[PDB]
Amino acid sequence: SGRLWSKAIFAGYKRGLRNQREHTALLKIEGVYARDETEFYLGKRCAYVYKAKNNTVTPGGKPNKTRVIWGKVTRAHGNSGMVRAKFRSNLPAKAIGHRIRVMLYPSRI
Amino acid sequence: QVLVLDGRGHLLGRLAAIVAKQVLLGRKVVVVRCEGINISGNFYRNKLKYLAFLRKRMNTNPSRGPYHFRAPSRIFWRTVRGMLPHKTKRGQAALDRLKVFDGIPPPYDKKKRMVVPAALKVVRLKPTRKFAYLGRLAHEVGWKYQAVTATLEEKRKEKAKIHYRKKKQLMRLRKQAEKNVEKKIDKYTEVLKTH
Amino acid sequence: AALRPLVKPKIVKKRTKKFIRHQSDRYVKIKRNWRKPRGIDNRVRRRFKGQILMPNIGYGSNKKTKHMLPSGFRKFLVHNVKELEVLLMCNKSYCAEIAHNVSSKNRKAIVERAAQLAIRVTNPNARLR
Amino acid sequence: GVDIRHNKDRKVRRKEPKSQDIYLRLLVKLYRFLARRTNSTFNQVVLKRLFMSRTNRPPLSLS
Amino acid sequence: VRYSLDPENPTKSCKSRGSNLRVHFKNTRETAQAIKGMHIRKATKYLKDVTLQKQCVPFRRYNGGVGRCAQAKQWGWTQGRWPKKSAEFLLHMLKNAESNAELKGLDVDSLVIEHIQVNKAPKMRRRTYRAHGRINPYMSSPCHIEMILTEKE
Amino acid sequence: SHRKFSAPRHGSLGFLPRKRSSRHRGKVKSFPKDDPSKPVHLTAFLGYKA
RNA sequence: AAAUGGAUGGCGCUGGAGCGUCGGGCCCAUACCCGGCCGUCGCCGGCCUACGCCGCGACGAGUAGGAGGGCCGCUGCGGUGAGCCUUGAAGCCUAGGGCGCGGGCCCGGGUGGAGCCGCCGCAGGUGCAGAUCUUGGUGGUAGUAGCAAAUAUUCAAACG
RNA sequence: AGGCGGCCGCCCCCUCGCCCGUCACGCACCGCACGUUCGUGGGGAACCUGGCGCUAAACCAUUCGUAGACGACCUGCUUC
Ligand SMILES: [Mg+2]
Ligand SMILES: [Mg+2]
Ligand SMILES: [Mg+2]
Ligand SMILES: [Mg+2]
Ligand SMILES: [Mg+2]
Ligand SMILES: [Mg+2]
Ligand SMILES: [Mg+2]
Ligand SMILES: [Mg+2]
Ligand SMILES: [Mg+2]
Numbered sequence: 051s052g053r054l055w056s057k058a059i060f061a062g063y064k065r066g067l068r069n070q071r072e073h074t075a076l077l078k079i080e081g082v083y084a085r086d087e088t089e090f091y092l093g094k095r096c097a098y099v100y101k102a103k104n105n106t107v108t109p110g111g112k113p114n115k116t117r118v119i120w121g122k123v124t125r126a127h128g129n130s131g132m133v134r135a136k137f138r139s140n141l142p143a144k145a146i147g148h149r150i151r152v153m154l155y156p157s158r159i
Numbered sequence: 160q161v162l163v164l165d166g167r168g169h170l171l172g173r174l175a176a177i178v179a180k181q182v183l184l185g186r187k188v189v190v191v192r193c194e195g196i197n198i199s200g201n202f203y204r205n206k207l208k209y210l211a212f213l214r215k216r217m218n219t220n221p222s223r224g225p226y227h228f229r230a231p232s233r234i235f236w237r238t239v240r241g242m243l244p245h246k247t248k249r250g251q252a253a254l255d256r257l258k259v260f261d262g263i264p265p266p267y268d269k270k271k272r273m274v275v276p277a278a279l280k281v282v283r284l285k286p287t288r289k290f291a292y293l294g295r296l297a298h299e300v301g302w303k304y305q306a307v308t309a310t311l312e313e314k315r316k317e318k319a320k321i322h323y324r325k326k327k328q329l330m331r332l333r334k335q336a337e338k339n340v341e342k343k344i345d346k347y348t349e350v351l352k353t354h
Numbered sequence: 355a356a357l358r359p360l361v362k363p364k365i366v367k368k369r370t371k372k373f374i375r376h377q378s379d380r381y382v383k384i385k386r387n388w389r390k391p392r393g394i395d396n397r398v399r400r401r402f403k404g405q406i407l408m409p410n411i412g413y414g415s416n417k418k419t420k421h422m423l424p425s426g427f428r429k430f431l432v433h434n435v436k437e438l439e440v441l442l443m444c445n446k447s448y449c450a451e452i453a454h455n456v457s458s459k460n461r462k463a464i465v466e467r468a469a470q471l472a473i474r475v476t477n478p479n480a481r482l483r
Numbered sequence: 484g485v486d487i488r489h490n491k492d493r494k495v496r497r498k499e500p501k502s503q504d505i506y507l508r509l510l511v512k513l514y515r516f517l518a519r520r521t522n523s524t525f526n527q528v529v530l531k532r533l534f535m536s537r538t539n540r541p542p543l544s545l546s
Numbered sequence: 547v548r549y550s551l552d553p554e555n556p557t558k559s560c561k562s563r564g565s566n567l568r569v570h571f572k573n574t575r576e577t578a579q580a581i582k583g584m585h586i587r588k589a590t591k592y593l594k595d596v597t598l599q600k601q602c603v604p605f606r607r608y609n610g611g612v613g614r615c616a617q618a619k620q621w622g623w624t625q626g627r628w629p630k631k632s633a634e635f636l637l638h639m640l641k642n643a644e645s646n647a648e649l650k651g652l653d654v655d656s657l658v659i660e661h662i663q664v665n666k667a668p669k670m671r672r673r674t675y676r677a678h679g680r681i682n683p684y685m686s687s688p689c690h691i692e693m694i695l696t697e698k699e
Numbered sequence: 700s701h702r703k704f705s706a707p708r709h710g711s712l713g714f715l716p717r718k719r720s721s722r723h724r725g726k727v728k729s730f731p732k733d734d735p736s737k738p739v740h741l742t743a744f745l746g747y748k749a
Numbered sequence: 750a751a752a753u754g755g756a757u758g759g760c761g762c763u764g765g766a767g768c769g770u771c772g773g774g775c776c777c778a779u780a781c782c783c784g785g786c787c788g789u790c791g792c793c794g795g796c797c798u799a800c801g802c803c804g805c806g807a808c809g810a811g812u813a814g815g816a817g818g819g820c821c822g823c824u825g826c827g828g829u830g831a832g833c834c835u836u837g838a839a840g841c842c843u844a845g846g847g848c849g850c851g852g853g854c855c856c857g858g859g860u861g862g863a864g865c866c867g868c869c870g871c872a873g874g875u876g877c878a879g880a881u882c883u884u885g886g887u888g889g890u891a892g893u894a895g896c897a898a899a900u901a902u903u904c905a906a907a908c909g
Numbered sequence: 910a911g912g913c914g915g916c917c918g919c920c921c922c923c924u925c926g927c928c929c930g931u932c933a934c935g936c937a938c939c940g941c942a943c944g945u946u947c948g949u950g951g952g953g954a955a956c957c958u959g960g961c962g963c964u965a966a967a968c969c970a971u972u973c974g975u976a977g978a979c980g981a982c983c984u985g986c987u988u989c
């Protein structure tokens with residue numbers, strides 16, 4: 051029991067002022083508010099949990115209504131502690147203002 | 160979840176910047192006591208700028224056009240409207256997540272109110288600069304509800320005093336309990352590991 | 355899982371949109387085929403951002419993965435038994451595809467000869483009885 | 484771009500002979516092989532003159 | 547002949563078609579949208595009320611410049627009009643569909659109107675006489691009508 | 700421009716939002732204020748213009 | 750001091766989100782470096798469609814215009830496929846599968862009923878988005894304007 | 910812009926409602942993801958059952974003129 055993943059709010063794509071680059075996303079992760087603090091999360095793996103009405107899940111026992119686009123942290127971003135992340139597929143852009151799980155695997159504890 | 164913010168002693172643009180940044184991420188923030196939000200500068204200048212804002216109106220039809228709110232909660236809500244992308248369905252969802260109240264509602268009388276240190280008058284102003292009250296501005300121009308809000312505010316302040324005396328009595332009782340004995344075996348461990 | 359051709363890598367196409375013609379949405383007299391606009395005011399020719407993209411040489415697919423079906427073969431059209439038997443030497447890279455005007459009576463003989471010679475055919479089970 | 488110089492991509496040359504004479508193409512094949520395999524600048528010049536046109540190969544006279 | 551929206555089964559369904567009949571296409575479409583999805587006796591009483599101007603027909607799509615009525619509040623709409631000629635023709639085709647159901651041997655008291663279709667017949671042309679010696683067309687708009695009536699259980 | 704004969708304006712902007720009123724009985728927009736010094740009484744009645 | 754209400758972009762900003770001097774980080778363009786792929790050009794290899802096959806390197810924007818390639822396409826002619834078919838050709842439709850970067854193409858499914866196509870050469874009345882383009886058809890307008898020059902009709906019956 | 914909390918007396922039990930020590934078990938599913946949560950999550954259409962109750966009102970039609978371009982608005986209708 052108990053949550054094993056750290057909370058991180060999706061903030062938006064990597065962008066300029068005008069144009070965007072949808073292959074890289076930004077994460078405001080809670081607790082981290084510093085460039086020196088966003089060092090431990092380099093290499094963590096992220097997961098966007100969302101819902102659909104067709105029966106497609108992981109084969110861990112039971113078929114359900116939960117879909118996940120996987121991905122992982124690439125590097126840090128800015129001085130405020132925001133974190134870049136490249137997922138395996140690009141974001142649906144509905145995920146703005148929603149939470150992406152950051153699970154505590156392969157990093158170097 | 161919800162972020163219940165006090166409005167006393169905060170500056171309008173600083174609090175609007177912090178609220179408009181924290182509402183785009185999804186944290187449902189509610190600014191309570193909006194009549195106490197201060198504005199730097201002279202109060203004559205602030206009501207002159209608000210009178211100029213009232214003077215801005217469409218001449219061919221004043222109804223179809225600029226809607227000039229006089230209530231201070233709606234003043235702060237227009238202030239955050241001008242900072243969020245409200246023409247898009249990101250700032251529209253952010254304005255749906257944002258709630259604002261003049262005076263204090265009963266659930267926010269119940270819950271605890273936060274205070275943002277970066278938006279404070281004392282933090283952001285040299286103490287010999289002039290300031291204003293948004294409730295004073297709203298009563299001086301349009302919003303005719305200062306007396307009822309002040310009466311209900313004094314009523315809930317009396318309620319808060321009669322709750323605080325009970326809470327402080329319970330805290331004196333629990334420190335008498337901490338003054339009593341047969342608890343120290345765990346307390347040595349807690350002092351050695353940050354009491 | 356029929357014939358499993360030789361080592362074919364990950365096939366990428368570098369875009370898969372078959373680029374639309376400008377203002378084909380606005381007028382239905384304009385077919386969806388690409389046609390290079392040669393106007394003096396056109397945003398597509400001037401290559402403004404946010405407009406459609408013109409097909410140029412940079413979208414060229416790899417020569418290793420050129421004309422590649424997703425099964426891993428390259429298609430070759432066939433009318434009859436001699437043009438099916440010409441695929442006898444390279445049957446593990448160049449698959450057969452029966453022409454549309456071939457009747458069912460000869461089509462069953464062609465697909466039986468392809469099953470004998472172990473030549474992949476794209477449409478074996480079409481126009482049967 | 485990168486190159487500030489002008490772009491003269493193809494220089495001048497005629498590599499394949501434009502004539503469809505089969506015998507001339509066979510001589511082109513043979514003397515191309517000899518020109519790249521013998522280090523003979525005679526074979527180089529004869530291969531270039533076989534690439535050369537009808538007008539630019541003027542008729543020699545017997546005298 | 548073929549229709550649109552072929553029924554569940556031809557045993558429990560009758561059919562009717564009128565072709566090249568002098569009405570307005572817009573009036574017959576807007577009354578067919580009110581006929582559709584209704585019991586046959588309710589539709590017959592409704593069309594008699596239309597011919598007696600006691601219950602109207604709401605114009606929902608072809609509502610350009612159509613005056614209002616108080617009777618359209620049954621339909622949740624504001625505008626209405628009372629097509630006498632369209633009501634007479636579609637009542638005659640409802641009687642024809644009733645006779646076809648009687649010939650096919652259906653339980654004639656429990657028919658609902660499942661499908662109705664109205665589409666533009668080739669219109670016939672006459673001419674006006676406008677100013678400055680000009681001739682302008684004066685064209686009709688007849689329609690083809692199909693209807694399917696099905697036993698409701 | 701410069702109309703050369705300035706006239707007072709026709710009508711009134713304060714009465715300009717003209718409409719068939721949804722009420723037929725003229726409702727009271729504002730009653731007079733109260734005080735504990737005055738005795739108990741009513742303010743408004745109904746009538747019919749004979 | 751200027752005429753509709755309005756512009757440091759707006760919101761706001763005073764221990765600055767203003768001014769002047771600056772420091773350390775941070776954000777990105779089709780700019781630069783590394784790498785994958787296409788094409789052009791240059792230099793080249795081989796006695797493996799020689800008009801094919803590889804090798805290395807540098808560069809690719811562009812109206813008017815000028816060239817090259819097109820296994821892009823339409824029509825007909827000579828050769829050519831012991832070509833295709835009434836066990837279904839052309840044509841048309843298609844929330845189907847695919848290829849090419851594109852000109853376009855191949856197959857699946859449905860109507861259709863008698864002609865059609867691949868390759869090498871040949872010859873064009875050979876490609877449409879416009880020209881107040883020509884002919885034909887069809888919408889919004891729209892069940893709208895309109896059926897108002899000259900005093901006027903009414904009851905009953907009959908054929909229906 | 911109110912619905913959970915506090916007191917008295919009973920109800921069927923708990924003297925493990927907790928911290929430290931002993932013992933043995935529960936799937937040990939043999940390297941792997943979306944697992945654990947306020948969920949007897951929001952609303953709509955129906956299925957079988959207990960208890961307690963409910964028995965109407967709009968719109969059209971007719972009339973009305975205090976209003977009406979048409980809609981709309983104010984109105985009457987009982988068997989005294
Ligand atoms: Mg220009
Ligand atoms: Mg122009
Ligand atoms: Mg370059
Ligand atoms: Mg209109
Ligand atoms: Mg009208
Ligand atoms: Mg006329
Ligand atoms: Mg009032
Ligand atoms: Mg300003
Ligand atoms: Mg500065």
Ligand SMILES: [Mg+2]
Pocket residue numbers: none
């Ligand atoms: Mg170029």
Ligand SMILES: [Mg+2]
Pocket residue numbers: none
């Ligand atoms: Mg062809």
Ligand SMILES: [Mg+2]
Pocket residue numbers: 874
């Ligand atoms: Mg021509």
Ligand SMILES: [Mg+2]
Pocket residue numbers: 874
């Ligand atoms: Mg000709």
Ligand SMILES: [Mg+2]
Pocket residue numbers: none
């Ligand atoms: Mg045309």
Ligand SMILES: [Mg+2]
Pocket residue numbers: 878879
């Ligand atoms: Mg043109």
Ligand SMILES: [Mg+2]
Pocket residue numbers: none
């Ligand atoms: Mg024209």
Ligand SMILES: [Mg+2]
Pocket residue numbers: none
């Ligand atoms: Mg027309």
Ligand SMILES: [Mg+2]
Pocket residue numbers: none
């Ligand atoms: Mg009119």
Ligand SMILES: [Mg+2]
Pocket residue numbers: none
């Ligand atoms: Mg009219």
Ligand SMILES: [Mg+2]
Pocket residue numbers: none
């Ligand atoms: Mg009679």
Ligand SMILES: [Mg+2]
Pocket residue numbers: 909
């Ligand atoms: Mg008679």
